[PDB]
Amino acid sequence: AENSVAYSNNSIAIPTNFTISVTTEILPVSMTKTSVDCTMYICGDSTECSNLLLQYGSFCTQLNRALTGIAVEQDKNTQEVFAQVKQIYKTPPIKDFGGFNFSQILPDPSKPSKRSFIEDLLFNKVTQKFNGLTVLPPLLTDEMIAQYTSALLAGTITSGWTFGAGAALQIPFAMQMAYRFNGIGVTQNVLYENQKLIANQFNSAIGKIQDSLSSTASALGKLQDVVNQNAQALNTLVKQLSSNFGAISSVLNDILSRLDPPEAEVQIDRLITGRLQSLQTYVTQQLIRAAEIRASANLAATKMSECVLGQSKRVDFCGKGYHLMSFPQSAPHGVVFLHVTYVPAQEKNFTTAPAICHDGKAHFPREGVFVSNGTHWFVTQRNFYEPQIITTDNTFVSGNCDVVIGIVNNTVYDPLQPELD
């Protein structure tokens, strides 16, 4: 949408209201751990064919090592993302966080595989030995992974930064948000005066999460395209057995039945040359595809150390807006974050001035912006409109009133003067 907001050299727009927004973000961490056996696949339990494969050197020694290097790596990728806490913290038995509910994300003491109320939905929107192909099971089961997210999340609501910097310390949540507010340059007096309103916004934003995850038909597209690619690359591998590759018959068994060894060996080599070359294609595809997952498994590793275990000043990564934290959530083959950010709203305009003339000396603001509501001038913080009387407690003196342009005339009240009288 086209927009054009008016700009003036002595005009500033300071927001007067905030709006807490919770935005999800889905990343893939690991994929299926496949493994292929050549003799069962290429040969097919044929002793005559097994001797022919020896002529091709050691092509399948590496083809089992290549599919194993990207098999232990997947179990490694899950380690950095989740296993970043030495000790498994536990939720306190009494939930009194000053109005914040957290029941939508905390573990649920109910039917087994004790996941959260949101993790249950995420496990429903994403949801074998035939010849050589197998599927190895992951080292970290979904039950154990859910405990890792039930230790980071269950502790970050009580300590904050302290997990990444030694033994955990106790801070009430009603006071922890004051730390978060002060990070974005907003004084803590805003929080305590608006605890009830913020808690309602915090709970309402989380409530819309599972009501929007279920509303959209496909919200897990990032985590589903990974599964589709793996299934598509595995289905095509099996169909390669139904191709002759230049031989009389696609199936290797009947060739030995009706052909002499002097002639069968000539045409079996067509199958072995084709099938072996048809297997190295997927191995190279997997190696490139695995490198595209580790590039995202490392992005989520940092986004769990920086967004979760602390407040990140990086703009527009830990959610869009002024970032505070991010409650991590499990996923079948990935991680789902819940970034809690601030989006200012309800804007108002004022006329500004870089300095103030009082007794021939400039008065720049110590912390805040000079604004006026039309007649009188005030000092307000950057991200929230709170006017205060201009005194020496929030201004400093430097230079002379002849070097910087745009100064207005006003009197800075000295708080010490009325005390003497």
Ligand X SMILES: *[C@@H]1O[C@H](CO)[C@@H](O[C@@H]2O[C@H](CO)[C@@H](O)[C@H](O)[C@H]2NC(C)=O)[C@H](O)[C@H]1NC(C)=O
Tell me which residues touch ligand X (CB under 6 A).
4-6, 13, 17, 19, 95, 101, 103, 194, 197, 345-346, 348-349, 357, 360, 373-376, 387, 409
- The region that residue 360 occupies, defined by phi over 0 for left and psi between -120 and 50 for alpha, beta otherwise, is left
Nearer residue to another protein within complex by CB, 171 or 205: 171
Residues 270-329 contacting a second copy, CB under 8 A? 274, 277-278, 280-281, 284-285, 287-288, 291-292, 295, 302, 305-306, 309-310, 312-317, 320-322
Q: How many Å is the maximal CA-CA distance in the chain? A: 121
Smallest distance from another protein to CB 322, Å? 9
**With CB cut-offs between 5 and 8 Å by kind, which of ligand NAG, a second copy, ligand X, none does residue 103 bind?**
ligand X
**DSSP β-ladder status, 33-35 and 134-136:** antiparallel
Residues 382-401 contacting a second copy, CB under 8 A? 396, 398-399
Residues 227-286 contacting another protein, CB under 8 A? 227, 230-231, 234, 238-242, 250-253, 256, 261, 264, 268, 271-272, 275-276, 279, 286
Residue among 72, 139, 144, 169 that touches a second copy (CB under 8 A): 169
Yes or no: say if 375 and 382 are a contact pair by the CB < 8 Å rule. Answer: no
| 47 counts as binding another protein under rule CB under 8 A | no
Smallest distance from a second copy to CB 125, Å? 31
Structure tokens at 52: 């022919």
d(CA 164, CA 317): 20
| 144 counts as binding another protein under rule CB under 8 A | yes
Smallest distance from another protein to CB 224, Å? 10
Helix (H, G, I), strand (E, B) or coil at 352: strand
Structure tokens at 254: 């009947």
Give the x-and-dash track for 101-120 against a second copy (CB under 8 A). Answer: --------------------
Smallest distance from ligand NAG to CB 204, Å? 22
Residue type, 227: V
Yes or no: say if 157 and 94 are a contact pair by the CB < 8 Å rule. Answer: no
Residue among 12, 126, 213, 343 that touches another protein (CB under 8 A): 343
Residues 6+ apart with CB under 8 A from 39: 45, 50, 53, 60
Smallest distance from ligand X to CB 193, Å? 9
d(CA 165, CA 156): 13
Helix (H, G, I), strand (E, B) or coil at 343: coil
Residue type, 334: G
d(CA 281, CA 146): 36
Residue among 172, 185, 207, 246 that touches another protein (CB under 8 A): 172
Nearer residue to a second copy within complex by CB, 78 or 116: 78
Smallest distance from another protein to CB 340, Å? 6
Rg (CA), the chain: 32
Residues 6+ apart with CB under 8 A from 256: 46, 48, 49, 264
Residue among 164, 185, 207, 261 that touches a second copy (CB under 8 A): 164
